[PDB]
Amino acid sequence: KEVKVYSGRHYNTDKEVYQKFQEQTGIKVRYIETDGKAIIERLKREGKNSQADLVILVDAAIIENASKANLFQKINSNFLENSVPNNLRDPRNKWFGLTRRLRVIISNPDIVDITKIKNFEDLTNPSFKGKVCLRNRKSPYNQSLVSNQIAKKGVGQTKIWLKGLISNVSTPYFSGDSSLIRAVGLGTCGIGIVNHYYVARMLDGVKGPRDASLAEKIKLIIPNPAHVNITAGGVYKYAENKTEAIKLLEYLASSEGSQGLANKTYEHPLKESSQNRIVSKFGDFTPDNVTIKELGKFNSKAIEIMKEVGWN
Numbered sequence: 001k002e003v004k005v006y007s008g009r010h011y012n013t014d015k016e017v018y019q020k021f022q023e024q025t026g027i028k029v030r031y032i033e034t035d036g037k038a039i040i041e042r043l044k045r046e047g048k049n050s051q052a053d054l055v056i057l058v059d060a061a062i063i064e065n066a067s068k069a070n071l072f073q074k075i076n077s078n079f080l081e082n083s084v085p086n087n088l089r090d091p092r093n094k095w096f097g098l099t100r101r102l103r104v105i106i107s108n109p110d111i112v113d114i115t116k117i118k119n120f121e122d123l124t125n126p127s128f129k130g131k132v133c134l135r136n137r138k139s140p141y142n143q144s145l146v147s148n149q150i151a152k153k154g155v156g157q158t159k160i161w162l163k164g165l166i167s168n169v170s171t172p173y174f175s176g177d178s179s180l181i182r183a184v185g186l187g188t189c190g191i192g193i194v195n196h197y198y199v200a201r202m203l204d205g206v207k208g209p210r211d212a213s214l215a216e217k218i219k220l221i222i223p224n225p226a227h228v229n230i231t232a233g234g235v236y237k238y239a240e241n242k243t244e245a246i247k248l249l250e251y252l253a254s255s256e257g258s259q260g261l262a263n264k265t266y267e268h269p270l271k272e273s274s275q276n277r278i279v280s281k282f283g284d285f286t287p288d289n290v291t292i293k294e295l296g297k298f299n300s301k302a303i304e305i306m307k308e309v310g311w312n
C-alpha cells in the first residue's frame with residue numbers, strides 16, 4: 001500500500017509530516033515537491049498515465065487553475081466535509097484547505113508613519129507617494145489579493161483602489177516576497193505587501209543573519225478584516241491509490257496534520273492560529289469571509305485590471 005504525492009508546497013519542509021503518516025498507517029508515501037504550475041502542466045500532459053494520487057497546491061489562483069484543468073475528482077469523506085471550514089474547501093468537494101496564510105502590509109516605521117496604516121485602502125494615501133513597493137503581478141499571491149478586493153467591492157471600486165496604489169509605487173516590481181521584505185527592512189521601500197510567513201522565516205534565522213537583521217526593522221500590519229489564502233489538497237482525477245490518498249488528505253487536514261504542515265512554514269493551521277511565538281506576536285486576525293472558491297472565480301478579472309492599471 002502506497003500513495004504518490006505531487007506537492008506545490010515548495011518550501012522543502014514537509015517530509016517529516018509524511019513520515020509521521022507512514023509510521024502511523026504503514027502506507028508508504030512517495031512525495032515529489034516542486035513548483036505547483038510545473039505539477040499542473042505535468043499532470044495535463046500525463047493524464048491517465050500519471051502516477052499522482054494526491055496533489056497539494058499553494059494559493060487559490062493555482063487551485064482554480066488545477067480545478068479548470070479537471071485535475072481533481074470529487075471525494076466522499078465524513079471527516080473532511082464535517083471538519084474543514086466551508087470557506088476553505090471546494091463546495092463540489094474536489095479540494096480541501098490544509099494551511100492558512102495572510103497577505104499583509106509590512107512597513108519601515110523610520111520611513112512612513114505606521115499610525116496612518118490599518119488596511120489595504122490606506123496604501124492609496126498620497127503621503128506614501130514613492131514609498132510603496134510591490135511584488136509583480138505574475139505572483140498568484142497578488143492576483144488572489146486583487147481577486148479578494150473584487151469579491152467584496154466589485155470591479156469598479158477595486159480599479160479605483162488599484163490606480164491609487166500603483167500611483168504610490170516608484171520602484172520596479174519585485175520578483176519575490178523575501179526580496180521585498182529586505183527592501184522594506186533596508187528602508188529603500190517604506191511599505192510592502194507580502195505573505196506573513198516569509199517575515200516569520202526571516203525573523204527565525206532560516207535565511208541567515210542579514211535577513212533576520214532586516215526583518216527586525218519591519219512593522220507587520222494585519223488588515224482588519226484579513227485576507228486569508230490557503231494551501232489545499234485534492235485527489236487526482238485518475239488516482240490509482242484513491243483510498244490511500246483520501247486517508248492521507250484526512251490526516252493532513254486533521255489538527256495534527258495541519259499543525260505539522262503549518263509549523264514547518266510558519267503558516268496558521270486550518271482551524272486554530274499558530275502556537276509559534278514569532279507568528280503570535282504579529283497579532284490576532286479576523287478573516288473577511290471571502291471564500292477560496294471566490295478568489296479563484298475572479299482571478300482572470302484581477303489579472304486583466306492589474307494589467308490595465310500597470311501593475312507589472
Ligand SMILES: [Fe+3]
Pocket residue numbers: 058195
Ligand atoms: Fe509562498
